[PDB]
């Protein structure tokens, strides 16, 4: 259905242990496809999915040259960031940047994105209009006016509206078999006693791609939102994901419970129940 | 492919 391309930058300072480290990873939905680490012997951008390997040499140089330059820039930004917050040159700090475009289920730009963070807290974010900024504090306002004064938002709108979509669509075509294929989850309910009066029903979802999924337990048709322990969706390692939902039911009442699954890989939402095989 | 704008704080 819908698709997105996202680049994630992380710059970490480590005083007394060398220069700050810069890593850049690129994604198309939940599939990683590029990586760059300034901490690698001979740092260059590397392929992380089958479909990007066909890209020519000039593509890899264009990429590497950008990320090498970004390594130097984010090193300066980490120093600047100390001034802005009156911080010592002894602490370790992190700057993170998230950016990219969303493609509407047709193929035109649905919305652009570009946020920055300082030590895990929002700093500056490009607004949805791709023309203005939202600075989180007085330090970020310094950055805002520097950006406004240099019309950065302009260059970004052009990337998010042009090149970002062009390439995403290009990657989407080349990686058709996987990028444009949804693998529904395999489902089943397990049962583990926990007392003579209560037992745990656990609904599983495995083998699915993309990561987005919804699991719910209903008792007599009522959602058990506040009673369902849900684990965070995790990666299996084969590109697919796993997730489960559990609820502790009273013994003899397991049939009043249903588990509901919704995934873009399923034509209709699934309902399951415990299947005690006789 | 990534962007090429000036990201100086």
């Amino acid at each position: 259905g819908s698709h997105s391309m996202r680049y994630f930058y992380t710059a970490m300072s480590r005083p007394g242990r060398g220069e700050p480290r810069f890593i850049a990873v690129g994604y198309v939905d939940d599939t990683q496809f590029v990586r760059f680490d300034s901490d690698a012997a001979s740092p260059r951008t590397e392929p992380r999915p089958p479909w990007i390997e066909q890209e020519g040499p000039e593509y890899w140089d264009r990429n590497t040259q950008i990320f090498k330059t970004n390594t130097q820039t984010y090193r300066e930004n980490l120093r600047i960031a100390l001034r802005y917050y009156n911080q010592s040159e002894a602490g370790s700090h992190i700057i993170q940047r998230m950016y990219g475009c969303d493609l509407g289920p047709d193929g035109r730009l649905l919305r652009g994105h570009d946020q920055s963070a300082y030590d895990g807290k929002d700093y500056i974010a490009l607004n949805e209009d791709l023309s203005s900024w939202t600075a989180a504090d007085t330090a970020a306002q310094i950055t805002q006016r520097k950006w406004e004064a240099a019309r950065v938002a302009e260059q970004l709108r052009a990337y998010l509206e042009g090149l970002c979509v062009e390439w995403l669509r290009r990657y989407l075509e080349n990686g058709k078999e996987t990028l444009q294929r949804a693998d529904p989850p395999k489902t089943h309910v397990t049962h583990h006693p926990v007392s003579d009066h209560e037992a745990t029903l656990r609904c599983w979802a495995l083998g699915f791609y993309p990561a987005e999924i919804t699991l719910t337990w209903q008792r007599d048709g009522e959602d058990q939102t506040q009673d369902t322990e849900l684990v965070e969706t995790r990666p299996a390692g084969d590109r697919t994901f796993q997730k489960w939902a559990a609820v502790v039911v009273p013994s003899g009442e397991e049939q009043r419970y249903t588990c509901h699954v919704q995934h873009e890989g399923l034509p209709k939402p699934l309902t399951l129940r415990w299947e005690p095989h006789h | 492919t990534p962007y090429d704008i000036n990201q100086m704080l």
Partner: protein
């Protein structure tokens, strides 16, 4: 500021004593990025263990996947040991077949 890692020890495929698999340890929701994760086989540490390239979620917290090719058995125990700045001491999570 500082967030402690969430930890999940599990296998890529459903566990069959005798059949080869992949032991996974997924650490997420932590900040800062420095983290030390070890896969344990009956207390001692597995040598060849790989991991994903660093990345973070929309709330800025990091996540990484640590995996090792393994082959479950009736007796053998497996666990994941994680150390992060937020931790008073290294947290160990025993692999459970039903989780």
């Amino acid at each position: 500021i500082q967030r402690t890692p969430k930890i999940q020890v599990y296998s890529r495929h459903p566990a069959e004593n005798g059949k080869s698999n992949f032991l996974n340890c997924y650490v997420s929701g932590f900040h800062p990025s420095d983290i030390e994760v070890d896969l344990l086989k009956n207390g001692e540490r597995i040598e060849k263990v790989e991991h994903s390239d660093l990345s973070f979620s929309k709330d800025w917290s990091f996540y990484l996947l640590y995996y090792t090719e393994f082959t479950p058995t009736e007796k053998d125990e497996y666990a994941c040991r994680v150390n992060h700045v937020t931790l008073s001491q290294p947290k160990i999570v025993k692999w459970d077949r039903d989780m």
